[PDB]
Design a protein around this ligand. Structure first.
Ligand SMILES: O=C(O)c1ccc2nc(-c3cc(Cl)cc(Cl)c3)oc2c1
Ligand SMILES: O=C(O)c1ccc2nc(-c3cc(Cl)cc(Cl)c3)oc2c1
Lengths: 115, 112
C-alpha cells in the first residue's frame, strides 16, 4: 500500500467516516486525470487506492470532498474541498500517508512518509 | 479590501515573506480563469488583490506557492502549493495559512 489517506473530524473528535476522496495525476498536457478514488472507512482511512506498479513518480492531487461531509452533519462549511498536491519521489523505499484534520472553516494536512 | 491572504512560517516563527499567491475564479465553461495575484509583504500579508466591484459571487481558488518559498530557504518541501477553494456569496475574507515543510493549515476569517 504505497498511498493511504486518513481523515479526522476536529468538531466531533472522531474519524471522518464516508468522506469521498479522489486522487488525480497530472498528465503531459498539464491537466488532472483521474487516478483512483474511494470513501473513508469507519476509522477514517482509505487503503488500496493504488499499487506500487501504478504509483510512479509524478504530480498527484488528493481531493477530499469536505463540503459534502459537513453538509451531511448539518454544519455550514467554507471550503469546496481540501486539496493536497505533491510530487512523489522514488528516493528509496517509501510509503505515503496523507492525513487531514477537518473543521468547517479550516483544515490541516500533513504527509507521513515512512520506509 | 474584500480578500486578504496571510501566510505564517511555523519553522521560523515568522511571517512568510515574498510568497507568491495566485487567485483563480471558475468560469462558465468550468475552467479556472486567472483572477488576481501578488506576493506577501514583510508582514506575511497580501492586500489589494481585488475590489468590491470585481469580487463577484463565484467559486474561487487561492493557490499559495509554498514550494518556491521553502526552496528559497534551502528546504525541499512535500507539497507543490497550498490550495484554498471556496464559494463566495460573507463580504470580507481573510485566508490564513500556516506552513511547515511537510504540512500546512489554512483557515478562513469571514467578517462583515
Ligand atoms: O495515520 C495515522 O494512523 C494517523 C493517526 C493519527 C493522526 N493524527 C493526525 C493528525 C493530527 C493533527 Cl493535530 C493534524 C493532522 Cl493534519 C493530522 O494524523 C494522523 C494519522
Ligand atoms: O496576528 C495576526 O494578525 C494573525 C492573522 C491571521 C492568522 N492566522 C493564524 C493562524 C492560522 C492557522 Cl491555519 C493556524 C494558527 Cl495556530 C494561526 O494566526 C494569525 C495571526
Amino acid at each position: 500500500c504505497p498511498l493511504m489517506v486518513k481523515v479526522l473530524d476536529a468538531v466531533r473528535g472522531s474519524p471522518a467516516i464516508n468522506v469521498a476522496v479522489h486522487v488525480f495525476r497530472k498528465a503531459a498536457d498539464d491537466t488532472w486525470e483521474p487516478f483512483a478514488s474511494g470513501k473513508t472507512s469507519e476509522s477514517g482511512e482509505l487503503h488500496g487506492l493504488t499499487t506500487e506498479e501504478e504509483f510512479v513518480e509524478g504530480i498527484y492531487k488528493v481531493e477530499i470532498d469536505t463540503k459534502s461531509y459537513w453538509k451531511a452533519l448539518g454544519i455550514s462549511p467554507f471550503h469546496e474541498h481540501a486539496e493536497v498536491v505533491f510530487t512523489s519521489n522514488d528516493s528509496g523505499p517509501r510509503r505515503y500517508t496523507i492525513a487531514a484534520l477537518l473543521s468547517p472553516y479550516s483544515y490541516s494536512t500533513t504527509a507521513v512518509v515512512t520506509n
